[PDB]
């Protein structure tokens, strides 16, 4: 016992005779000879073995046509192995053939772990699918683990190892028709930014601006980026570029700055630094700039301050006044925060000499300066002699 004898010739029928047209019409037979004769709930596994070796012609090479057109897709859905899917979309839910075919698939994916990202490709490529993705949902249900996200991530990772051109092609449709299982967590992001070249990164960046792709929501994003500080230089770099495309305000992610260490987060710091420049500084943004501790090597805080104060002398001075006074009142951490803020200001002052602009000589700073002198011992007052004594007059 092995194959079914009334079927043994059908196993090798289309093994040679291979012209696309006389293949799909010589395939509809195999569909309907499982309905009439039930073929158990176990005979499903034997047909999977002799079709895996049958369609090796297909899995190697490319899955995508050269020219990106609807008929170019239709040419690749016309391909023999893509008929099964055509059947599965036309059917109905309560129909017991909906699960029967599904269990043939859920067994064929089990042997060949690449039917998954094919399934995704079909459901976009073919217009017999009608865009509907519920068929992939049905598939991931059937799969032993039963989870859609876990399944999706397996398929995409397979695709990202096999045909990156396809992974880039699909990425808009995946993030669109499955927002819940995609947007929140950036494993799918990490997958993409680990294979995409400069052309593809642009390809994707345009989709975002066309509004044809969303890879982040404002609630999900800051978490993803936190996770990005681990990735490879260019993955991180690619991630920020995709973020910058999205138009979420920099305020949403400004807390990330607490997580950014000089000696180890340069890609992340660079991008953020070069973005912070073009921003009307909110109070919180100032607060975070000031919150990073003073290393003599870390030039980032004085970079961003010098730049902000050119463009926004007073608005900034206000912010420094508020926070200064706010921490003046509030002690152990208050004095450490105050000291750190004072130190930062001193670095800026020892820097700003190279310009004859006036930031440090305006009232809202001056006010806040002498005011916060009160709550100081000689340990501080003598260190920042120059800074304080710059505000002698009142």
């Amino acid at each position: 016992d092995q194959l079914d004898e009334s079927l043994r010739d059908k196993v090798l029928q289309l093994q040679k005779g291979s012209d696309t047209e006389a293949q799909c019409e010589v395939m509809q037979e195999i569909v309907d000879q499982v309905l009439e004769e039930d073929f158990d709930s176990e005979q499903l596994s034997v047909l999977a073995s002799c079709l895996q070796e049958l369609f090796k012609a297909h899995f190697r090479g490319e899955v995508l046509p050269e020219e990106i057109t609807e008929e170019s897709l239709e040419e690749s859905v016309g391909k023999p192995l893509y008929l099964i899917f055509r059947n599965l979309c036309q059917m109905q839910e309560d129909n017991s053939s909906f699960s029967l075919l599904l269990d043939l698939l859920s067994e064929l994916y089990q042997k060949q772990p690449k039917i998954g990202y094919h399934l995704l490709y079909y459901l976009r490529a073919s217009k017999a699918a009608a865009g509907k993705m519920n068929l992939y949902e049905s598939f991931a249900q059937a799969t032993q683990l039963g989870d859609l996200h876990t399944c999706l991530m397996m398929d995409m990772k397979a695709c990202q190892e096999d045909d990156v051109r396809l992974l880039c092609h699909l990425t808009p449709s995946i993030y669109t028709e499955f927002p819940d299982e995609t947007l929140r967590s950036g494993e799918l992001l990490n997958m993409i930014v680990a294979v995409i070249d400069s052309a593809q990164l642009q390809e994707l960046v345009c989709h975002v601006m066309m509004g044809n792709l969303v890879m982040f929501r404002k609630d999900s994003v800051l978490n993803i980026l936190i996770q990005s500080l681990d990735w490879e230089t260019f993955e991180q770099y690619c991630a920020w570029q995709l973020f910058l495309a999205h138009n979420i305000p920099l305020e949403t992610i400004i807390p990330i700055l607490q997580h950014l260490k000089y000696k180890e987060h340069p890609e992340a710091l660079s991008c953020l630094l070069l973005q912070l420049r073009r921003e009307k500084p909110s109070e919180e943004m100032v607060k975070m700039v000031l919150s990073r501790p003073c290393h003599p090597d870390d030039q980032f805080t004085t970079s961003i301050l010098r730049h902000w104060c050119m463009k926004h002398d007073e608005l900034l001075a206000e912010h420094i006044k508020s926070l200064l006074i706010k921490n003046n009142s509030l002690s152990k951490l208050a004095q450490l925060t105050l000291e750190q803020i004072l130190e930062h200001l001193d670095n800026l002052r020892l820097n700003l000499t190279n310009t004859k602009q006036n930031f440090f000589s305006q009232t809202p700073i001056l006010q806040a300066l002498q005011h916060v002198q009160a709550s100081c011992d000689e340990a501080h007052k003598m260190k920042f002699s120059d800074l304080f004594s710059l505000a002698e007059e009142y």
Binding site: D197, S198, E232, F234
Partner: protein, 86 residues
């Protein structure tokens, strides 16, 4: 064709080769130190070079492609001398 180790060592390399192309700077010695480590016939050894070229082109790493081209030259000459010798 080869062992469990080889099959996998070749996968670990492919991966590391891709990380290595995506590094900043122009030290490709790490790439070759790695490419020497590939397991199997000169066919597959040259398949690893071919692949690295495809990658380095995406990143326009012109010098690196030159040096990969020289490995390819050397892998070819050796193979030409194989038939001559055998």
């Amino acid at each position: 064709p080869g062992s469990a180790m080889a099959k996998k060592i070749n996968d670990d390399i492919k991966y590391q080769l891709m990380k290595e192309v995506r590094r900043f700077g122009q030290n490709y010695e790490r790439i070759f130190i790695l490419l020497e480590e590939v397991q199997g016939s000169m066919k597959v050894k040259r398949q690893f070079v071919e692949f690295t070229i495809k990658e380095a082109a995406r990143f326009k790493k012109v010098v690196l492609i030159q040096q990969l081209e020289k490995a390819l030259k050397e892998i070819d000459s050796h193979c030409h001398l194989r038939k001559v010798k055998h």
